[PDB]
Design an enzyme around this catalytic site. Structure first.
Site, PDB file in Angstrom:
ATOM      1  CD  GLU B  11     111.183  14.757  84.422  1.00  0.00           C
ATOM      2  OE1 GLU B  11     110.583  15.103  85.467  1.00  0.00           O
ATOM      3  OE2 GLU B  11     111.484  13.584  84.163  1.00  0.00           O
ATOM      4  CG  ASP B  20     111.030  10.164  91.370  1.00  0.00           C
ATOM      5  OD1 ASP B  20     111.269   9.277  92.231  1.00  0.00           O
ATOM      6  OD2 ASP B  20     111.809  10.447  90.409  1.00  0.00           O
ATOM      7  CG  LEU B  32     116.867  12.049  88.853  1.00  0.00           C
ATOM      8  CD1 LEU B  32     117.251  10.544  88.623  1.00  0.00           C
ATOM      9  CD2 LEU B  32     115.411  12.143  89.207  1.00  0.00           C
ATOM     10  CG  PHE B 104     117.163  15.119  80.727  1.00  0.00           C
ATOM     11  CD1 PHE B 104     116.099  15.010  81.549  1.00  0.00           C
ATOM     12  CD2 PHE B 104     117.910  16.286  80.778  1.00  0.00           C
ATOM     13  CE1 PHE B 104     115.764  15.993  82.440  1.00  0.00           C
ATOM     14  CE2 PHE B 104     117.571  17.296  81.682  1.00  0.00           C
ATOM     15  CZ  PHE B 104     116.475  17.138  82.506  1.00  0.00           C
ATOM     16  CB  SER B 117     115.755   0.001  70.516  1.00  0.00           C
ATOM     17  OG  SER B 117     114.681  -0.825  70.795  1.00  0.00           O
ATOM     18  CG  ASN B 132     113.117  -4.023  70.213  1.00  0.00           C
ATOM     19  OD1 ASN B 132     112.787  -5.152  69.856  1.00  0.00           O
ATOM     20  ND2 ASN B 132     114.201  -3.778  70.953  1.00  0.00           N
TER      21      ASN B 132
END
Ligand SMILES: [Ca+2]
Ligand SMILES: [Ca+2]
Ligand SMILES: [Ca+2]
EC number: 3.2.1.17
Lengths: 437, 446
Positions: B11, B20, B32, B104, B117, B132
């Site tokens: 990030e 974004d 965010l 995150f 998964s 996967n």
């Protein structure tokens, strides 16, 4: 990583009473005793703070009692100062140590006259603060210490202090001559191999230092032959540690840096400021001159000596190392001896194989001294994120460093450090482990 | 490396509100601004989150505080989630960071949707989990990032977060052929000198032949790349090889040759370079039809001339075409990749302490560049001064340069470096800081 250790670097332990720069009788670790040329009062103000007017010499145990009482009074001084305390509370843990260092040395009120620098520190104008402090009388009176403190204010780091390597030296040193500690060659060897569990200088000790050199062998048994018959300063200890991991090219940089007058010869005067090295390098009365070929050979022999000693330590006295013995050494060398995943690879992933000879072990150690040449040679593998196969590794070692690693050394390396089971070593599995200790 | 350092790579730090690709306003280290459908709404959300009238702009410390809360919130989202906590508990420390990374990025609920998964991770079926996850919309949205995370699940090491080079190649590559991207010699030169400036173009097999056409017309020396300009092709692997050349000390030139000479016959054949679709380097080394063998002297000359070319091009870049660099021009070159806080201190030192003195010739600049390949020796020299308790003043700096390179550097350069990095103004070189700036400056491809 704290004020107490900072200050034992800065203020040196002295068990006899001594005049400071400012001329006051002082003792221990920068303890101020009296501001009076009367020495009788220096043992009086001493007494009620100790339990006895003195004993002539204090001993260390009580010297630390003092040192602790001062450090807290220093903090107390700041916390109850109007000008200092706000500054002090805006500061992170390390900068606070820097400022505690100042008051310990000069007093709460002296450090309170540094008006502007104090302003800048509260504003975290680190750069202007460092510049202004460096012009002060305090800097001029003790510039090496003031620089370390100022750099701490500038960077908020301990980079200026090497607290760990001063702690190793004292933990292994066994001799003292007026506050100055000394290693013997035996102490030095123990300090590079063991974590732990390894008096005052006398005329015997000094006489032994010359005769030891007369009797010790001149090659790779020099320090083992000397044993306790010798003397190594803190500075010489750091010098040897700085160079002993280097390839020959590093020896030559060190030699050229000593050779100030440019005649390709070191004179006792050009060497650091009689020790074992001084006597070895410059003879008894200090007028032999050290040529580079002799310096290089000495450093090569000490590297070999360390290799032979470590080999027998991990072989437990046997002539050959078991692969498991080499693996144990590998863990300690890579500083991964407390990671369970590697110990599990040792116990469960290692075939019984041929044993490992001293010569094979030495070739591995030689390779480790050329790691940066090897890393540079390996860059296409690393940049491509392409894990390296055993045969490619073997060849790269030979091409980049001249060394022949046996398949059995390399099998051990690969079985220990291959973490994802592809039988290859990625950059982080081995190079990343080294020097990112 | 840890989850903090991992996310700092994944990030980009945004000190100003950033919208974004997914259409979210963001700030800091991937924070965010959720209740913000407009820029002005995002400033309102941000001002509340920081407790300050920010006008859309925050400080590094404010970013770090948000970053720590966001990582803390991701960990709590894991530990309170019935599907996520057992997997997390089962995982080693590195793979735990990969799971926190996903939470995150996507939120606990989103990650908890990867049921199969997650099961495979708890069962330590790492390759099968990775296969996967790679098919998902998550991966398709941010494939570079997702691949780093997935490769971390696969290997259990930090290998995907070191030695990062491909994204920068792609930034500058101007050509594509059958899914593979290529640089022109001009793209490569720009990627070396600039932080950033591309409208990629496809190539037919005919475009290739003609682009590769004319190699014999280019200069054979230090103008080779500049003469070719956009008339050439460089693959990703050749790009990495060229990066290794640029940093390479002369001491390592023959080893580099021998590493490629896998049959030991003192010549490199096209097939041995293959161990690293015609390209500029292949045509130059091995001829049009791959028939020529590359000997050491020509290989060494190639490396020397490439290093010279970059130095000549950078010299004129920062001299703005004048025949000499000003001291300030040399300072501009040296500080060109330094970051904002430290950069303001160095420039203050430039403005306030430099005197115009004698301008800096190309040969003097080149000599400084050669010195940067002897920095291990220079650091030993600094250690020797430190052991002797000798302050590193200008004379000590000069002597260390002479010992590290075997030649004296010119006063106009050494005095400029010294005034920039005499940080305390006490006639002492802050040589650790200097070397950090220099090594970073000279480290191509970051
Ligand atoms: Ca000399
Ligand atoms: Ca592996
Ligand atoms: Ca060949």
């Amino acid at each position: 990583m704290n004020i107490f250790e900072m200050l034992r670097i800065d203020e040196r332990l002295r068990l006899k009473i001594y005049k400071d720069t400012e001329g006051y009788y002082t003792i221990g670790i920068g303890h101020l005793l009296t501001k009076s040329p009367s020495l009788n009062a220096a043992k009086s103000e001493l007494d009620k703070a100790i339990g006895r007017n003195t004993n002539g010499v204090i001993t260390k145990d009580e010297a630390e009692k003092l040192f602790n009482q001062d450090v807290d009074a220093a903090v107390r001084g700041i916390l109850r100062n109007a000008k200092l305390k706000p500054v002090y509370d805006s500061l992170d843990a390390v900068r606070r140590a820097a400022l505690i260092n100042m008051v310990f040395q000069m007093g709460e009120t002296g450090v309170a006259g540094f008006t502007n620098s104090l302003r800048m520190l509260q504003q975290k104008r680190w750069d202007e603060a460092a510049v202004n402090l460096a012009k002060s009388i305090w800097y001029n009176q003790t510039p090496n210490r003031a620089k370390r403190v100022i750099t701490t204010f500038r960077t908020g780091t301990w980079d200026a202090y090497h607290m760990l390597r001063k702690q190793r030296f004292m933990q292994f040193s066994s001799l003292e001559h007026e506050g100055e500690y000394y290693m013997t060659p035996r102490d030095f060897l123990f300090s590079v191999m063991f974590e732990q569990m390894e008096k005052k200088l006398t005329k015997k000790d000094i006489e032994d230092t010359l005769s030891g050199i007369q009797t010790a062998g001149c090659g790779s048994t020099f320090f083992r032959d000397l044993g306790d018959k010798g003397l190594i300063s803190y500075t010489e200890y750091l010098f040897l540690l700085t160079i002993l991991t280097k390839p020959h090219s590093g020896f030559h940089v060190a030699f050229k840096m000593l050779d100030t007058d440019g005649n390709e010869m070191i004179e006792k005067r050009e060497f650091f400021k009689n020790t074992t090295l001084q006597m070895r390098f410059f003879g008894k009365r200090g007028q032999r001159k050290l040529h580079y070929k002799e310096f290089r050979r000495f450093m090569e022999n000490l590297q070999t000596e360390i290799q032979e000693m470590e080999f027998l330590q991990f072989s437990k006295g046997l002539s050959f190392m078991r692969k498991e013995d080499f693996a144990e050494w590998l863990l300690f060398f890579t500083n991964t001896e407390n990671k369970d995943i590697y110990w599990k690879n040792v116990r469960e992933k290692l075939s019984a194989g041929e044993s490992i000879s001293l010569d094979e072990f030495k070739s591995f150690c030689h390779f480790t001294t050329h790691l940066e040449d090897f890393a540079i040679a390996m860059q296409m593998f690393s940049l491509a994120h392409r894990p390296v196969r055993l045969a490619e590794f073997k060849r790269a070692v030979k091409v980049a460093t001249g060394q022949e690693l046996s398949n059995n050394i390399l099998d051990t390396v690969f079985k220990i450090f291959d973490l994802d089971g592809d039988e290859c070593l990625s950059h982080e599995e081995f190079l990343g482990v080294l020097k990112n200790r």
